[PDB]
Amino acid sequence: VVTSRPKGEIHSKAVVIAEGVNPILTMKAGLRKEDLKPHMVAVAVKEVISVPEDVVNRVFGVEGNDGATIELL
Amino acid sequence: VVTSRPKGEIHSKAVVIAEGVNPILTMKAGLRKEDLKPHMVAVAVKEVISVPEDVVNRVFGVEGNDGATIELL
Amino acid sequence: MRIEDKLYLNRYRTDEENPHLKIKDESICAEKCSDRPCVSCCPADVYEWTESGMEVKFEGCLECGTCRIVCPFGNIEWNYPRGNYGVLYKFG
Amino acid sequence: MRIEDKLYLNRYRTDEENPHLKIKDESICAEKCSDRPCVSCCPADVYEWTESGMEVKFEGCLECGTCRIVCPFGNIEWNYPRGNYGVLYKFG
Numbered sequence: 001v002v003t004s005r006p007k008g009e010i011h012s013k014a015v016v017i018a019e020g021v022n023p024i025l026t027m028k029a030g031l032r033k034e035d036l037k038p039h040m041v042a043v044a045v046k047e048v049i050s051v052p053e054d055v056v057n058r059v060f061g062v063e064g065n066d067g068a069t070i071e072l073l
Numbered sequence: 074v075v076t077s078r079p080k081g082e083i084h085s086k087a088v089v090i091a092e093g094v095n096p097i098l099t100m101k102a103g104l105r106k107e108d109l110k111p112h113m114v115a116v117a118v119k120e121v122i123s124v125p126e127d128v129v130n131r132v133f134g135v136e137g138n139d140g141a142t143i144e145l146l
Numbered sequence: 147m148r149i150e151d152k153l154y155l156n157r158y159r160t161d162e163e164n165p166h167l168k169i170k171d172e173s174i175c176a177e178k179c180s181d182r183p184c185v186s187c188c189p190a191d192v193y194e195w196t197e198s199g200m201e202v203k204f205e206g207c208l209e210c211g212t213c214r215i216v217c218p219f220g221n222i223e224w225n226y227p228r229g230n231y232g233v234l235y236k237f238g
Numbered sequence: 239m240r241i242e243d244k245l246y247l248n249r250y251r252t253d254e255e256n257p258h259l260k261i262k263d264e265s266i267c268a269e270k271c272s273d274r275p276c277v278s279c280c281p282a283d284v285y286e287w288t289e290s291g292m293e294v295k296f297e298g299c300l301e302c303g304t305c306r307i308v309c310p311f312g313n314i315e316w317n318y319p320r321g322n323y324g325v326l327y328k329f330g
């Protein structure tokens with residue numbers, strides 16, 4: 001592995017490309033013969049909203065480190 | 074209408090038997106030729122539980138004189 | 147014991163001199179009846195079949211009317227209590 | 239204005255001397271492109287098509303990678319920022 005660091009050259013017997021989506025480093029290894037087309041990916045926009053620990057209990061119907069997940073269609 | 078009161082005899086041109094289930098007074102008027110059999114009625118047992126106005130908001134997911142109804146099967 | 151804890155929560159004006167639940171024939175409850183559905187379907191545990199006869203604790207009657215209807219032989223003289231008597235449901 | 243209110247909430251270490259979003263050919267964005275999907279699909283309003291060219295405000299880039307993929311002609315030299323640079327998501 002070569003890095004953006006100045007003296008950065010890490011030697012290894014194997015390299016695990018666990019770098020997620022945007023397969024920039026996968027294309028350098030010969031895998032991913034093309035880039036991602038805009039039908040293999042989904043733009044996911046997320047907000048983390050500060051809701052003060054008791055309205056979370058009220059609007060989800062839970063209490064005390066028990067959680068609920070909503071899936072919105 | 075005659076009542077359980079001592080001098081109780083109310084005179085009227087019409088009598089509306091709006092006395093609910095247990096058709097005791099309906100059978101006196103000639104209607105309901107038999108009593109209720111135990112398949113025309115359902116025993117409904119109800120508790121009113123004191124839950125202090127904010128756990129009601131939390132367990133129903135509501136707030137401020139907005140209510141929710143659960144039907145349990 | 148168990149349901150008279152919950153019948154204590156209700157409000158009553160008991161009419162003890164006028165029992166509104168009379169059993170028309172005690173002998174039907176001894177040999178003619180098999181399962182006693184007045185006991186097993188009373189929401190207030192009013193009826194209890196002893197060997198001394200049927201104990202009708204009419205003071206806890208919730209005036210539902212199940213006993214009169216669930217009795218197969220019709221031997222429950224069922225009335226409502228008088229006016230201003232019986233259960234008095236607060237926030238019913 | 240609107241989304242840079244929300245980009246102010248994020249934490250950045252901006253690398254201003256190294257823009258990681260370069261456009262390979264500005265002429266493809268003027269006549270070859272019709273709808274400019276880099277502008278209309280950028281979650282951080284990085285791309286803005288003026289008549290002076292394409293304004294690439296790379297400092298607010300959320301490093302998602304949409305622009306590189308949604309661009310039909312491939313003329314976005316898209317890199318991640320260097321290590322310890324770009325978005326730094328706290329409770330991501």
Ligand code: SF4
Pocket residue numbers: 169174175176179180182183184185216217218219220221222
């Ligand atoms: S149901 Fe009718 S018969 Fe059976 S016990 Fe109650 S009263 Fe006696």
Ligand code: SF4
Pocket residue numbers: 167187188189190191192193206207208209210211212213214
């Ligand atoms: S009325 Fe309801 S409560 Fe009173 S005895 Fe008959 S069943 Fe039990």
Ligand code: SF4
Pocket residue numbers: 261266267268271272274275276277308309310311312313314
């Ligand atoms: S998409 Fe490719 S071509 Fe269309 S504007 Fe953005 S960069 Fe220029």
Ligand code: SF4
Pocket residue numbers: 259279280281282283284285298299300301302303304305306
């Ligand atoms: S990466 Fe995500 S945010 Fe940064 S420019 Fe491309 S699209 Fe806009």
